[PDB]
From a paper:
β-lactamases inactivate β-lactam antibiotics by hydrolyzing and “opening” their signature β-lactam ring. In serine-based β-lactamases of Class A, C and D, this hydrolytic process is executed in the deacylation step involving an activated water molecule carrying out nucleophilic attack on the enzyme-substrate acyl adduct ES*. Here we report structural and computational studies of Class A β-lactamase [name] with Glu166Tyr mutation that analyze the interactions between this critical water molecule, termed WAT_Nu, and other components of the active site during a full cycle of hydrolysis. In summary, by analyzing the reaction intermediates observed in the active site of a Class A β-lactamase hydrolyzing a β-lactam substrate, our study has uncovered critical features within the active site that coordinate and activate the water molecule for hydrolysis.
We set out to capture structures for in crystallo deacylation reaction intermediate by transferring cephaloridine-soaked Glu166Tyr crystals into cephaloridine-free buffer for 1, 3 or 6 seconds and then flash-freezing for x-ray data collection. Notably, the deacylation_3s structure reveals two distinct conformations in the active site. In one of the two Glu166Tyr molecules in the asymmetric unit, both WAT_Nu and Glu166Tyr are shifted back toward ES*, occupying positions similar to those observed in the apo structure. Under this new conformation, WAT_Nu re-establishes hydrogen bond with Ser70 and is positioned within ~2.3 Å away from the carbonyl carbon of ES*on the right trajectory for nucleophilic attack. In this “attack” conformation, the Bürgi–Dunitz (BD) angle of the approaching trajectory, i.e. defined as the WAT_Nu-C-O angle, is ~100°. Unexpectedly, for the other Glu166Tyr molecule in the asymmetric unit, an alternative conformation with the carbonyl of ES* tilted almost 90° upward and away from the amide group of Ala237 of the oxyanion hole. In this “tilted” conformation, WAT_Nu forms a strong hydrogen bond directly with the carbonyl oxygen of ES* across a short distance of only ~2.3 Å, locking itself into a conformation not suitable for nucleophilic attack. In summary, our QM/MM results suggest that the “attack” conformation is catalytically competent with favorable potential energy profile that matches experimental data. In contrast, the “tilted” conformation with strong hydrogen bond between WAT_Nu and the tilted carbonyl oxygen is not catalytically competent.
Residue numbers in the entry: 31 to 57, 59 to 83, 86 to 238, 240 to 252, 254 to 293
Amino acid sequence: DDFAKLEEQFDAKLGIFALDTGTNRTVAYRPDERFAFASTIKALTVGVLLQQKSIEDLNQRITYTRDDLVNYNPITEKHVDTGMTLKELADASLRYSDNAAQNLILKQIGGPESLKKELRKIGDEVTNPERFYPELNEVNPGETQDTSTARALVTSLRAFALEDKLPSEKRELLIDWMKRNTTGDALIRAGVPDGWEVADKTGAASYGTRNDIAIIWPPKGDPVVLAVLSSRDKKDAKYDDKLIAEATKVVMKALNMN
Ligand SMILES: CC1=C(C(=O)O)N[C@@H]([C@@H](C=O)NC(=O)Cc2cccs2)SC1
């Protein structure tokens, strides 16, 4: 009941799945409960992009205009005049959660419907991409569009980053981007001792949805893959990062890593 206690303290619903890739030991709490995936989808999106292109092909330059910019464009809003390469867009999407970058990448891989088809091909029957930004943040309780589960996001992040859905050079690019994420310092990273390498992707959406998916490398040992998803009862609810940090501390204890 440490997970239950956190739902009580933060008045939120929590979805946890963690897999120690070294022992196949698992920590779960509502692991199959749907949540809006929010920006966590960006990680899986770069997965599919990497699978479909050579590394050299990421050097294709994408021209775009103000009309491709949406509600949060911290990198893309600076380079309308020059455009950005696919590699630069992958960096913006993963490290800054640039929503226009995600939309431009989605367009290059054939849109939300194409992304869905490529996720089913890697064995993910759960994650349901259907819309672009900004609409994908808008998910009402009980709806399944743009939702996933903690178990499915772990299984899929692991498949791309650590297994055989990508060749080693592409896994390395994806892991490196996620390792240098700038948006995650208050979430999973804040539940993990300084010095352990962490790769993560955050998200936030309606109903106070607040998510983080990560790979954690304990000093030595095989890594852990973790999803912490959360949501609240009201549409305009605020979230609290500290719920994710605290849930992460619980996982690390339950796995005897701290
Ligand atoms: C703060 C934030 C993140 C993140 O932390 O990863 N990613 C982008 C996106 C996906 O989560 N969120 C939105 O665009 C919708 C919003 C929810 C709360 C503020 S904006 S923009 C909002």
